[PDB]
Amino acid sequence: NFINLYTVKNPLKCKIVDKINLVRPNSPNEVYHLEINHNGLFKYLEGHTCGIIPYYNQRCARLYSISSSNNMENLSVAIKIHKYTNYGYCSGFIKNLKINDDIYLTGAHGYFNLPNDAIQKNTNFIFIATGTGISPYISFLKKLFAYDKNNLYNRNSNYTGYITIYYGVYNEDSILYLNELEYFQKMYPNNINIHYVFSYKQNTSFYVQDEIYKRKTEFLNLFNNYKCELYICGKKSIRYKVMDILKSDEKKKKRVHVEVY
Amino acid sequence: NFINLYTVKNPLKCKIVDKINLVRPNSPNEVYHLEINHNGLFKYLEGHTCGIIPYYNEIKKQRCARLYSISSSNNMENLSVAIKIHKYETNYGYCSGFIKNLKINDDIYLTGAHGYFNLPNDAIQKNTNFIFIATGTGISPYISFLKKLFAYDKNNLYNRNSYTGYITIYYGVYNEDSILYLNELEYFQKMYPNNINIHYVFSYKTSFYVQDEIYKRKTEFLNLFNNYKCELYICGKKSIRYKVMDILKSDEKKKKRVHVEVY
């Protein structure tokens, strides 16, 4: 496996290649996409998180979902900058990062991966996310659809499954990896469908779970009839309402994946 | 004055006196109330947080502290803290697992105090009114406040001994068994029925959270904040903020009266 190949006691020294503002000006969020050069040495599968040790050489690491596929030279992450101005520990660190600065990662973590024969089987997917929770799904799509930023005009994909995405963000200027999401949507309209759920519409609260609930029968159809592998990434609450819909098998629980923070 | 007396560099060595399950069986949560003996050495005002450094000793050199709101009053010998145990898969959060495994009389290392989520310095004398808004462990500093204002003493609950302002509490939790510090909260409502009003918003029951309840009765909330010069506090989830603020919005001196601590 690629898990724990690097730890806080022997982290990988990497370099920042790019740092991009991921949101657009109507967003109340501040989120940076980081392109990180790891000399081909950081090993990972799509869905894995990496740890970043702020100000390394307190030695405390933070987890971040990898937003790139295995085949790509550099790796990437999306980091929301937390504020209370004071910043979160890592938040403050990422904020003052400069291009070509050193950054220390800890070996692959987590098990939020694709089934190992997803392309062969054309397995269908339900991806549910909020905020930065979209990152692993972006890494998933980049793999399944053989994405290439320098070669977007070709395809290239042997994946013929159907992917449904439910994504909750504040507004549309808060949708992360919109470039990619809109691209996949245009290039593969028979393979992918996306429902955005914006929290700004309120002020009743209405979130991504509530949308799933509105589409209960359709959601049940996809999971049951199309044997979708079901993923949840973001708010911890998403769980109960979505799990309830399914309940209303052990063979089924292996098809459900959860990563909340 | 008390901020950063203890740091990650010089943490205060304390003792676990008690460790109590704060929720009741129908709760899906696990949360422990820790009584901590700091030998009068840890200084704080009501509303402050302390840091706990998991696995600290005099292993590896991970000094990674987490903040927890103090739920006791200054006058109490020991200090209180309520910690939700975070799980995934089971695996535990970093500090969560450390607290999970904590025994009575174990060493625990504190930093602090931290924060400025504090009462007005003359609240009792001026009998100032309050609106406290909370979710989950966000009730903690409000418990601290109440213990100071109402002169709470576990060993002398049959005495009145209290402040005569009005406090309105909006508290969002999963269900009844998930109410943290239900004993105290029920004791305050029984003993000071004309000085406190608690509104519970249960998420187990579209979504409907604590802000939505407040938006449901926004005119009365407006009247409380404006007609009673209430100090407004918000502790818990970041989202609460905007829904509540908007009603207030539709300023310069009224922002001195609003307090927010989100996590």
Ligand SMILES: Cc1cc2nc3c(=O)[nH]c(=O)nc-3n(C[C@H](O)[C@H](O)[C@H](O)COP(=O)(O)OP(=O)(O)OC[C@H]3O[C@@H](n4cnc5c(N)ncnc54)[C@H](O)[C@@H]3O)c2cc1C
């Ligand atoms: C499996 C997993 C995957 C994750 N993936 C991502 C991801 O892809 N992208 C992403 O952005 N994040 C992700 N996270 C979360 C991320 O790891 C961090 O938790 C996040 O970046 C905040 O870290 P921080 O050090 O900046 O904040 P911290 O310093 O750890 O503080 C945590 C929060 O408390 C607040 N805070 C800190 N100090 C105070 C204070 N004294 N008073 C009041 N408030 C305070 C901060 O504002 C912050 O919001 C993931 C987490 C997990 C567990």
Ligand SMILES: Cc1cc2nc3c(=O)[nH]c(=O)nc-3n(C[C@H](O)[C@H](O)[C@H](O)COP(=O)(O)OP(=O)(O)OC[C@H]3O[C@@H](n4cnc5c(N)ncnc54)[C@H](O)[C@@H]3O)c2cc1C
């Ligand atoms: C001002 C302030 C006051 C606070 N007051 C309180 C309080 O009174 N009571 C309280 O309980 N908390 C409070 N908090 C939050 C608290 O400080 C901690 O953030 C909380 O205890 C979680 O810390 P942890 O080390 O156990 O989880 P961490 O290890 O830091 O991880 C954070 C979350 O991610 C999950 N996670 C970690 N690693 C993984 C992984 N590898 N894969 C998947 N998931 C993972 C954990 O389960 C956890 O839910 C407060 C925070 C602030 C900023």
Ligand SMILES: Nc1ncnc2c1ncn2[C@@H]1O[C@H](COP(=O)(O)O)[C@@H](O)[C@H]1OP(=O)(O)O
């Ligand atoms: N309990 C919840 N369940 C699902 N989504 C939520 C919940 N609380 C907030 N959200 C939403 O998740 C999205 C991303 O949040 P974040 O930026 O904190 O990661 C936002 O739209 C946020 O709405 P809100 O605007 O109410 O915060």
Ligand SMILES: Nc1ncnc2c1ncn2[C@@H]1O[C@H](COP(=O)(O)O)[C@@H](O)[C@H]1OP(=O)(O)O
């Ligand atoms: N965006 C939100 N705004 C207000 N309350 C929320 C939000 N998301 C969750 N909650 C609720 O706050 C309470 C405390 O949560 P926690 O246990 O995480 O501290 C829970 O009832 C939780 O409901 P839910 O059951 O939907 O998570």
